[PDB]
Design an enzyme around this catalytic site. Structure first.
Site, mmCIF file in Angstrom:
data_model
loop_
_atom_site.group_PDB
_atom_site.id
_atom_site.type_symbol
_atom_site.label_atom_id
_atom_site.label_comp_id
_atom_site.label_asym_id
_atom_site.label_seq_id
_atom_site.Cartn_x
_atom_site.Cartn_y
_atom_site.Cartn_z
ATOM 1 N N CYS A 1 0.855 -1.194 0.000
ATOM 2 C CA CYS A 1 0.000 0.000 0.000
ATOM 3 C C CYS A 1 0.888 1.241 0.000
ATOM 4 C CB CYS A 1 -0.945 0.006 1.197
ATOM 5 S SG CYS A 1 -2.123 1.369 1.147
ATOM 6 N N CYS B 1 -0.475 4.378 1.873
ATOM 7 C CA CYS B 1 -0.363 4.311 3.321
ATOM 8 C C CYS B 1 1.074 4.503 3.801
ATOM 9 C CB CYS B 1 -0.894 2.968 3.825
ATOM 10 S SG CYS B 1 -0.857 2.837 5.621
ATOM 11 N N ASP B 2 2.043 3.843 3.162
ATOM 12 C CA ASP B 2 3.414 3.802 3.674
ATOM 13 C C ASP B 2 4.390 4.711 2.934
ATOM 14 O OD1 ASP B 2 2.657 1.880 5.541
ATOM 15 O OD2 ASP B 2 3.253 0.192 4.288
#
Ligand SMILES: Cc1cc2nc3c(=O)[nH]c(=O)nc-3n(C[C@H](O)[C@H](O)[C@H](O)COP(=O)(O)OP(=O)(O)OC[C@H]3O[C@@H](n4cnc5c(N)ncnc54)[C@H](O)[C@@H]3O)c2cc1C
Ligand SMILES: Cc1cc2nc3c(=O)[nH]c(=O)nc-3n(C[C@H](O)[C@H](O)[C@H](O)COP(=O)(O)OP(=O)(O)OC[C@H]3O[C@@H](n4cnc5c(N)ncnc54)[C@H](O)[C@@H]3O)c2cc1C
Ligand SMILES: [Ca+2]
Lengths: 316, 296
Positions: free
Chosen positions: A137, A140-141
């Site tokens: 992801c 997200c990261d």
């Protein structure tokens, strides 16, 4: 407002034919519904070039065109469609919480509809460094890798979009592809100064110290592999496994790996349904996935309205 | 006129048509036996707006027409034929219609749930009362008959009976104004705004106005299972019982769509049932270890 944007009656994770059909029915029931879809090009139906066995849709039709019709139907009747990748769930309370980089969505009913384009983490080190440098992801990261080296593995629409996300942060984005990416959208990605293309290269191994990933081992077209320093490895290879990682083992699974459901598509957790190929039944067809979503929507309407009976949605 | 097929599908609604679409694409010789293409639940729906993938305004019988056309395009034989009985006692199942006896390695029950429970109607079933004019029509030559109902099946069935009966007494709840063709026949007596109070007869029906045959075509919400005569297990609610792959208690016989009488009565759910059954049938008839998906 915050409640308007994120608090729904029904949260559907995945916008393939199962999720879109579910939304069509819950929206027509006047339930406030959101579809959280990580990428409309990554589903099994969207990648099908020509579907000829969807009953009621004759002639030549691409899978992504059929899906667009279904998505547009759901939205026409009131569904909110959002591009958002779900990476976690809190299922322990009547109001379910759904974690995306776009925020936390809440639902009185939750629908898992992410399909089965996933894969087992088979590269050596891949399972070992999950959450410690290995991620699936980028929205997200990505921010954790500002000014750091990252690796993106795969040639498909998801990999290209996620690689572009990472160019906003990474010092270098090493793109490992099995074949020539020129085979746009690659042009736009390859124009970023931070992208380094490794065409026809295979990712052999992911390694690190205790603190997390520090390098990958790769073999590009000479008998001897080489090591490339990297702190983040984002793998977007396609497979045939149900996409269940983000559920963190919170619902019962069948021995085959699919989400277990009862006759009304409800999982082992009250208020959570599972539909389509995330169930990993042998009957992997678009119309079967759509039928699942319909059943779930009808069960959700009974549940959220405390009805005595399932209420069919019939024209008169 | 072939009567031997790999798969026999009883009923041509969305369940049966989707099943046929898939079995035909599997290269299985498939026949749909459909008593009346206008009599199914989908066919009588005026405007369906929740079939996923079909946007805008569509009549139910136009959606069904597309499905039927798809099944036939890939090799299905579509026949107008009413099934009145079955023989399931041997591996090759026998399906009885007035058009002949069809046989199949696999049998699919897909007749929906537009049926109704039987005013003395039940007492006289098989003697006077009948639900298949194409089966019993010849038996009422020069005899008084009654037809009850205003719907596609009743108009078509009433016209069949005009070929034999001395008088066709048609009991309708409202003005029939295909009715014009029927009412133009001299033997038709129309009893508009007339309700049938009861059915009476002797040991040998005799009246209800004196008559000898009463054909009831009132629509309802019950699974249409009379022709199965209890040869497959039925759920306490009246629906046909099936396992996870839509197989009934009799191996080689499947049940799909609203004949199962689940609460989830929608066209796409019925279509999904038909797909599952077709995939299971393909595995069964080819002795496969695993289900084989049909992917482009
Ligand atoms: C190569 C191939 C060919 C096929 N051909 C046919 C055919 O001809 N006919 C037919 O009937 N079927 C066909 N199928 C099968 C059919 O495509 C699938 O059965 C059906 O698409 C499954 O629907 P689904 O909604 O469960 O999932 P999918 O269609 O895979 O959709 C899942 C959605 O979830 C999203 N998603 C995944 N993870 C997340 C997450 N964490 N957060 C948010 N969103 C997420 C994905 O982006 C995607 O949009 C084919 C499949 C494949 C793989
Ligand atoms: C008034 C009404 C409105 C509806 N509106 C909608 C809607 O808006 N959306 C939606 O999704 N669903 C709707 N439905 C439900 C949907 O129409 C049904 O769930 C679906 O049609 C069931 O499909 P089926 O193939 O099981 O059977 P059916 O569609 O009922 O078809 C059964 C077929 O079998 C045939 N048959 C019956 N007996 C015999 C026999 N003895 N031998 C041979 N053939 C036989 C019939 O002639 C018919 O062709 C509606 C239903 C009704 C009653
Ligand atoms: Ca079941």
């Amino acid at each position: 407002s915050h409640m308007e944007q994120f608090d729904f009656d029904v949260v559907i994770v995945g916008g393939g034919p199962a999720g879109c059909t579910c939304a069509l029915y819950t929206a027509r029931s006047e339930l406030k519904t959101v579809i959280l879809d990580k990428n409309p090009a990554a589903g099994a139906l969207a990648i099908t070039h020509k579907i000829a066995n969807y009953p009621g849709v004759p002639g030549e039709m691409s899978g992504d065109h059929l899906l667009e019709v279904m998505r547009d139907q759901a939205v026409e009747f009131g569904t909110v469609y959002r591009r958002a990748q779900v990476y976690g769930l809190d299922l322990s309370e009547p109001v379910k919480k759904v974690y995306t980089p776009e925020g936390i969505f809440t639902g009185r009913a939750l629908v898992l509809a992410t399909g089965a384009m996933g894969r087992i983490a088979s590269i050596p080190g891949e399972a070992e460094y999950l959450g410690r440098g290995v991620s699936y992801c980028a929205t997200c990261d990505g921010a954790f890798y500002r000014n750091r080296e990252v690796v993106v593995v795969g040639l498909n629409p998801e990999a290209v979009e996620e690689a572009q996300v990472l160019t906003k942060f990474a010092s270098t984005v090493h793109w490992i592809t099995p074949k020539d990416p020129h085979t746009g959208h690659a042009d736009e990605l390859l124009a970023h100064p931070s992208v380094k293309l490794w065409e026809k290269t295979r990712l052999i191994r992911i390694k690190g110290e205790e603190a997390g990933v520090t390098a990958v081992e790769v073999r590009h077209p000479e008998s001897d592999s080489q090591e490339l320093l990297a702190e983040g490895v984002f793998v977007y290879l396609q497979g045939s496994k149900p996409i269940t990682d983000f559920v963190a083992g919170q619902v019962e699974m069948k021995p085959d790996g699919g989400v277990w459901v009862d006759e009304m598509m409800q999982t082992s957790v009250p208020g959570v349904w599972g539909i389509g190929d995330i169930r990993n039944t042998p009957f992997k067809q678009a119309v079967v996935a759509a039928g699942d979503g319909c059943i779930a929507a009808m069960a959700i309407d009974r549940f959220l309205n405390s009805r005595k009976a399932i209420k069919p949605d019939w024209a008169h």
